[PDB]
Amino acid sequence: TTTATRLTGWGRTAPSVANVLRTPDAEMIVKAVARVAESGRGAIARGLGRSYGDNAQNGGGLVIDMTPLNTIHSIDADTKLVDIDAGVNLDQLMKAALPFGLWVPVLPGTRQVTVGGAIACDIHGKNHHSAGSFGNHVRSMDLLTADGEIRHLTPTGEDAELFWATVGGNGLTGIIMRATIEMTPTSTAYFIADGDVTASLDETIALHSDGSEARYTYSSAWFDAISAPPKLGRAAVSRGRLATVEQLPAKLRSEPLKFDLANKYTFGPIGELWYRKSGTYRGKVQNLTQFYHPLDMAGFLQYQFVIPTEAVDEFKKIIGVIQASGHYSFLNVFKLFGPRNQAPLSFPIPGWNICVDFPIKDGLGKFVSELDRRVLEFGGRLYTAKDSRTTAETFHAMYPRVDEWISVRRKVDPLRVFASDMARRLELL
Ligand SMILES: Cc1cc2nc3c(=O)[nH]c(=O)nc-3n(C[C@H](O)[C@H](O)[C@H](O)COP(=O)(O)OP(=O)(O)OC[C@H]3O[C@@H](n4cnc5c(N)ncnc54)[C@H](O)[C@@H]3O)c2cc1C
Ligand SMILES: O=c1nc(N2CCCCC2)sc2c(NO)cc(C(F)(F)F)cc12
């Protein structure tokens, strides 16, 4: 079913109309690409549309919806390998793999993302400093390339260059049809978590520098970006690891792999004490929602960037520029990222990662451009999955291996068959 449809990112801006093919037939998808390879607005895959930007739309072009390709082919507990269609979402995968004592190795902050989208944006999670990003756990993928052929890529094979170009490649090397992922063994669906509350930016940084991070596989913090210094950058830090069966309480040991406001006090000293109490704890047993999606149970601009580890002073500065700006962000996530991977367009690098969420109002666009500049000057970068407004020139300087990447893309799609709004804006075409 080919249908002219109006598509936007999760942020619901920069709308664009395209011919949306939605089919469960992989043979239909190979033909639509062959067709597009004849006649020149190109094609692009789309997952669940959870990316905020314009990387999954192609104005006046073809957009292939991959979510009907959602078959899990096999799960093997001994090898820890799952073999799945690209349109399988990580929530679906999570529930399918638990009974085998397997855990999805990298989870983002929403489980409604496809494997293809997980690979194409090379997503990260609370465990990046211990496990890397999603691409590090893919052992193979089958990629529908511009020549109508389906190539079988692996991280260390002869096609390693193309594999790593596809990881974080935002769909611009072809369609990931199928992949094999190595899962993390687990005896439990639960976490054991430690909580800590800091009073300032310099404490937060101290906590993340003292060596405690190495004792936790998962870590992230809620972060104050409004309150002026000294309060600026105080945080609720939440850290932990998957629980073993031995560490669960009686009630949960029979089904260990299961899954199924303001008052007058709030802003005074009693609230400060209460919040400090609630956010301080040791060895709390917690399920996925409680630990990983604590938010559970349009008109905003999402902005995420990472600054190199060494440039700690420069990070403090950027955070100060944000609270002084008049633009207030209430929901902020902070994390120290670990080592990077071989993918040239992969976002994560070791250093200070922060996500902020600004209300759309007058002055924002021009303030965010100036932020881009500070982020660039300080050796950091923005995340494509959260962006629709940065310039090609900024992007290119932020990702110095883009040229290396462009070369790989030139060989595999010399006719520019795969294209998107983002590719044209960021001049990756
Ligand atoms: C509330 C929320 C929280 C989030 N938290 C995080 C987080 O913690 N960490 C993180 O890293 N990201 C996070 N994200 C971003 C999200 O993980 C990525 O945007 C992800 O790529 C979206 O997956 P999707 O399946 O919706 O892909 P879409 O948004 O539909 O597409 C995204 C990109 O993947 C490509 N693509 C999709 N399918 C295929 C395929 N089969 N073959 C080739 N290319 C394909 C598209 O062409 C496009 O370039 C979050 C997003 C939201 C809305
Ligand atoms: O857990 C997360 N939840 C998020 N969302 C749900 C709550 C509301 C806003 C979106 S965003 C996010 C980001 N930024 O993208 C980074 C990290 C990380 F650094 F990996 F720890 C975690 C999250």
Numbering used by the authors: 7 to 45, 48 to 268, 283 to 319, 330 to 461
Give sentences from the paper.
DprE1 is the first of two enzymes that catalyze the conversion of decaprenylphosphoryl-β-D-ribose (DPR) to decaprenylphosphoryl-β-D-arabinose (DPA). In its natural context, DprE1 catalyzes the oxidation of the 2′ hydroxyl group of DPR to give the ketone decaprenylphosphoryl-2-keto-β-D-erythropentofuranose (DPX), with flavin adenine dinucleotide (FAD) acting as the oxidant in the reaction. After BTZs have entered the catalytic pocket of DprE1 containing the reduced form of the flavin cofactor (FADH2), which was generated by oxidation of the substrate, the nitro group of the BTZs is reduced to nitroso which can then form a covalent bond with a nearby cysteine residue (Cys387, Mtb enzyme numbering). We obtained co-crystal structures of Mtb-DprE1 with BTZ compounds 1, 2, 9, and 12 and BOZ compound 5.
Compounds 1 and 8 are the two-electron reduced forms of 7 and 12, respectively, also referred to as nitroso. We were interested to compare the kinetics of inactivation of DprE1 by 1 and 8, which do not require activation, relative to the BTZ counterparts, 7 and 12, that require reductive activation. Unbiased difference density maps, calculated with phases from structure models prior to incorporation of the ligand, demonstrated that all five compounds formed a covalent bond with the active site cysteine (Cys387). The nitroso-BTZ 1 bound in the same way that CT325 did, corroborating the ability of CT325 to serve as a BTZ substitute. For instance, the planes of the BTZ scaffold of compounds 1 and 5 enclose an angle of 15°, with the other three compounds in between these two extremes. The complexes with BTZ and BOZ inhibitors induce partial ordering of the 315–330 loop in some cases (compounds 1, 2 and 12). We used the nitroso-BTZ (1) and hydroxylamino-BTZ (2) as positive controls, which demonstrated that a +343 Da species is detected by mass spectrometry and therefore any trace of this species, if it occurred with 11, would have been observed.
